[PDB]
Amino acid sequence: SDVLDITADPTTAPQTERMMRINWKKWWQVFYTVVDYVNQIIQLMSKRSRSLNSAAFYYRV
């Protein structure tokens, strides 16, 4: 497919190892996503100077 775009797909390995690694990467990716999410709030904090009511949205509800 394409000009050598797909020339490394047939690893032909129906093994639980790689599959479980994908399962682990799914958790691992969202684990850094939840961090990035909070990090984004910290970026928002810069555009929304004085984010006391924002960060403490818990008590705001």
In angstroms, the CA 34 to CA 11 distance is: 32
The answer to whether residues 32 and 24 touch, using CB atoms and an 8 Å cutoff, is no
The answer to whether residues 43 and 51 touch, using CB atoms and an 8 Å cutoff, is no
Q: Which distant-in-sequence residues (6+ apart) come within 8 Å of 53 by Cβ?
A: 60
Residues 24-38: b if buried by 16+ CB within 10 A, e if exposed: eeeeeeeeeeeeeee
Domain spans in the chain, listed from the N-terminal domain onward: 1-61
At position 24, the amino acid (one-letter code) is: W
Residues 5-18: b if buried by 16+ CB within 10 A, e if exposed: eeeeeeeeeeeeee
Q: State how far Cα 12 lies from the chain centre.
A: 28
- Establish whether 5 is an annotated binding residue: no
The answer to whether residues 48 and 54 touch, using CB atoms and an 8 Å cutoff, is yes
Method for structure elucidation? NMR
Q: Which distant-in-sequence residues (6+ apart) come within 8 Å of 44 by Cβ?
A: 51, 54
